[model samples]
Target: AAAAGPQVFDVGPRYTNLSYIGEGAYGMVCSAYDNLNKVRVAIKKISPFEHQTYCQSTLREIKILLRFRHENIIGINDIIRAPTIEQMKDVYIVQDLMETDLYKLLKTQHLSNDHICYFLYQILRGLKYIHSANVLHRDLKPSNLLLNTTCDLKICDFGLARVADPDHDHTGFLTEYVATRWYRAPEIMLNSKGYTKSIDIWSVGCILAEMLSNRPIFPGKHYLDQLNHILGILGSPSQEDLNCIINLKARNYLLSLPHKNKVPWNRLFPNADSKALDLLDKMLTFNPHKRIEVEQALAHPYLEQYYDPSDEPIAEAPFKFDMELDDLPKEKLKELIFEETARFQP
Candidate 1:
């Protein structure tokens, strides 16, 4: 229906000029100024991906981001898919131009307790909105959180985000390799069959820990090495924890691994206050079922003082978390994109 409605068309001549910023999982990013709106915008170019998973993920990201109206989420202004498949195989995603991402910020600046608290607050508020919508942001890391000079952060890169109900979603594959290695949850790392919103919490814990330590807390050589890295720090899983695991094979593998005792929180965050460590502990729990939800994390003593849910742009989503295009083949994708782009092309 959207592809047949009113839309933005030409993406080239309308923009004053375009320059390369960087490239990532999606494609190349370019910086430009919108001539019509008179604002600086980032054009994230989406390349044609042959892998069905990649295309499905890309489609989900575009659809969801286009529907999101929250300030903490990146605003997609205009799309620039060509009118015909033979004309081009790339789609340009136009959105607000942010100064930097959290990854670069952590590497360059030292975040104070105040700064860390503020950043986490925004992140949680954003997560609250996302979770309320029943969406799962499977990939959440510093690199994916866009940061601005105004101390604002917007969640970006949603190739792995989708509706939580798999029965409704067409994504039929789940692998040990999903989220980034360091930020991935134990359930995902161990190849669990079914996971939940708690997966993002594990990532937040890793990100928070990374910010505090100035590096990735669980920097692993590979997937197995990543498990060892987590085990070395969080210690081995208890029987109760193992009981929560979704996959029998993964649960048995974890059970077979040498059990370890958890390293004390004090040692890991020697400089952090008890309240901060306590909240972080809740987020980094080994069991997904035990992990703190966004509401609980925001109300924790460490963040409660600044908790003002109304302060941020919290609005009900205008669109559903539909993965209707998840099963579309590569050729079908081009057809849909071409038709969709036609609505905007004058």
Candidate 2:
């Protein structure tokens, strides 16, 4: 198995400095100076082929990253290719270098309503393209929202994302464990396998709330505790609303809890502008079907100042992942990853 830390970049001599910046469960990241491009870039290196799930996730991320062209979306500058198919091991994803993420920014800076609106607008604008391309960013959190010193934000971390399957209800092949629980939608928490793009919408709401309060809107000690936080504020779901919960146990748990009245938005966000709170109400709806969409959210009064039809560009084509990639056995996946790495060679 690949070690969980950065060792030798071995990403060729083009990139210098190769400063190891951080590490996550799936990969290690570093900042490097690209000699060819004459700019700093972040490199996420991973030996994804170590497992079947990792190979498929890595492939989907690279494929979508390569196809996207949006200012609010993270841009992939390049992918370092191996010398040969036989030598292929770690895959390096090169992307634009951003100074920090929303997670850190929220912790460090005090944001005005204008700052919140602008950041929220950009996120929905990017989500518009992503949903248009028939993809679900299963994982959307403050940490994944990268920001530069200028306050320009770009959505990153597509590892837990995937293009929607047309045949099904645009769900299921995904694991129920997608995304951080705090930012997860109600349907997802109930183990609903057939969720839609609305899941991403809910996250944006949670993120917006976090930006305002500088604390997680639903900071739960455990998954059930997390559910309680959401229910505690939003109130118990109506019987019809509970239909979205697929897990019998999850639904029963909700029924077991005494019904709680919905907290007035004004009460929750005392000092927040009414317009911002209105948008939040629509986004954090318990039922996915009733939740605000990216397009609808962008059109809301709160974001009207920043919304521009010309600036929000939708993807020209839906990202097409090799359907067989998920079905490929371990050996086939290894060979396929090597084949994929060759396409990005400089």
Candidate 3:
């Protein structure tokens, strides 16, 4: 097992003193630099005191990173064990630090058609590689999709990922609590016992829609609330569909909600061409079985007809890690990590 191997600490000079980048339930990410490579990188440090379950998540992430290599996917550089002053052990995973995440980019302004096409194409390409490797990145969101210095999109964060084995009958059971709430697929939302690669496709659809709209397609505070939000946009499931989810905990609440379906994609993206709208509709279907697979999405007319490689423009100002590092203080860095962990615990 990789975990049982001899522990080695990276002795090289730490470039760009550690600064807080982002935080979540799983762990806190720090922005740092690899002086050897002269490039900025993100360091995801798993807190020892959080929970033992996260250890499995970290291991899974490492396994997936090591197994899959693609231009559109985030690259893992190295793994290090950093002993903390507290008696607990801290594990760090070093990855290519991206210029910014899709969420942060969206906050500044709306995404142009060309930008959307480029980002979506890269995401689909990455998903194709992930599915090909028999792994499912169940957690797909704007925050997880990163933009490199060149503005190229790279998919990151595989904490909620799971291996998709053809012979595994209990795969669905293993991924019950996997996906983020809003981005979860219909099968997962409905609690279908049998699921497959289709789950990630559903999330891709949600993420695509969110990117175009610059807002969450479904923003539900709780699980049931999320169901209502989804049902409000897409009508209630049929009897057959309901039967599949009947065994789930909150299945009854979904049945009680009134059907309030939204207008189709053509109406949703009036500015977008017909081909783009057509592809979006197929990908966003409530039925997981009906959701378009990665390969199918790749072949869609939107990618073939509308995609322009040159249209995805790079930032005039290059990503300067030294400039960013100079602005951040050491005390501020420590505070960021502490605040990030406190949010999850509190």
Candidate 4:
């Protein structure tokens, strides 16, 4: 077959070199060398078409990246734009290059408790900051967590994330399409009225368990199976606990299901550290109200060694996003994205 070796993007003269990387959740990525900084960075080419969600998601991620500044969170160094707004077909985002994602590492390597703790501590710490900013990552998973040779982990991928507003009740408007099926919190799956960062905490718990056993704790075949897998381990939620499922249909289904005994943590992760298991239990609680908060999880004995009050910083202010992103047209999104690229102009 006569074809090109790889598709190369013209990110302008600033990036002297480029090498195609693999595709990502919403775009194709490449590793490019930045001449100005003399560093290798990741360039994600995002084409915001086919639908308006893509455009809004792209804008949301870029807007969040532009404001966030944390060692354990991916940062944007620059954004590249096309020649003209009319000619623009794709936009590029420049970020720190990570050696690999946690999913790949978890598959090939045997991680020590030390490795897991550091990785977890960073995730919780980063989550604290993100939550402090009143933003819900909503999509935390093993693959979304980036890692390096030094074991430094940075949370990435904010396309599905949203900023929570305190003044109004956005719960009724909260989109149900969030986090992967397996990692999704019970509240989300049960169709709870209003969800909190506990959703992310549940996901973190799933990741921790997976790392301990080297397998997904809840590998559900479907949404129903996913909830069943979780319930199978957690056992039947008490009647009072079932009250949280505002969806009457979902509630009735749980009420009708056969009662199941709670699986002992020891039986599930026999060799895991007791302290680690304890934290996992708290994080995996079916009741979102009872799930451990990010600060509490960071303070748990399992992560006590690395816990430092001085080092853990919260966001200075809450991040605010226009609620209008819901219905913004393609042209407006393009203009907003084009305007974002000018932030890097010298």
RMSD in angstroms, all models?
A: 5.4, 3.4, 11.8, 2.9
Please identify model 1 stretches exceeding 4 Å from their true place.
Answer: 1-10, 49-54, 84-88, 166-175, 191-194, 246-248, 312-315, 318-326, 339-346
Top candidate on TM-score is 4
Name model 4 segments beyond 4 Å from true.
Answer: 1-8, 165-178, 193-195, 320-322
What C-alpha lDDT do the candidate models reach, one value each?
Answer: 0.76, 0.81, 0.65, 0.82
Model 2 lDDT-worst window of ten: 166-175
**TM, every model:** 0.87, 0.90, 0.74, 0.92
TM-score of 4: 0.92
Evaluated against the true structure, the overall lDDT of model 1 is: 0.76
Q: Which regions in candidate 3 have their CA more than 4 angstroms from the true location?
A: 1-11, 14-28, 82-88, 165-178, 193-195, 238-262, 305-346
Candidate 3 residue 126 C-alpha distance from true site, Å? 0.3
Span of 10 residues, lowest total lDDT, candidate 3: 317-326
Runs of candidate 2 with Cα error greater than 4 angstroms are 1-6, 165-176, 243-251, 320-324
Estimate candidate 4's alpha-carbon lDDT, on a 0 to 1 scale: 0.82
- Tens digits of per-residue lDDT for model 4 on 247-305? 67677888889999999999999988899999999999998778899999999999999
Q: List the residue pairs that clash in candidate 2.
A: none
Name the top lDDT candidate.
4
Over 34-147, each residue of candidate 3 has an lDDT whose tens digit, in order, gives 786887777776654344345545555665676567777887776554333243355566788788889888887688887888788988888877876666777888998999
Compare candidates 1 and 3 on TM-score and give the better one.
1
Better of 1 and 4 by TM-score: 4
Give the TM-score (vs. native) of candidate 2: 0.90
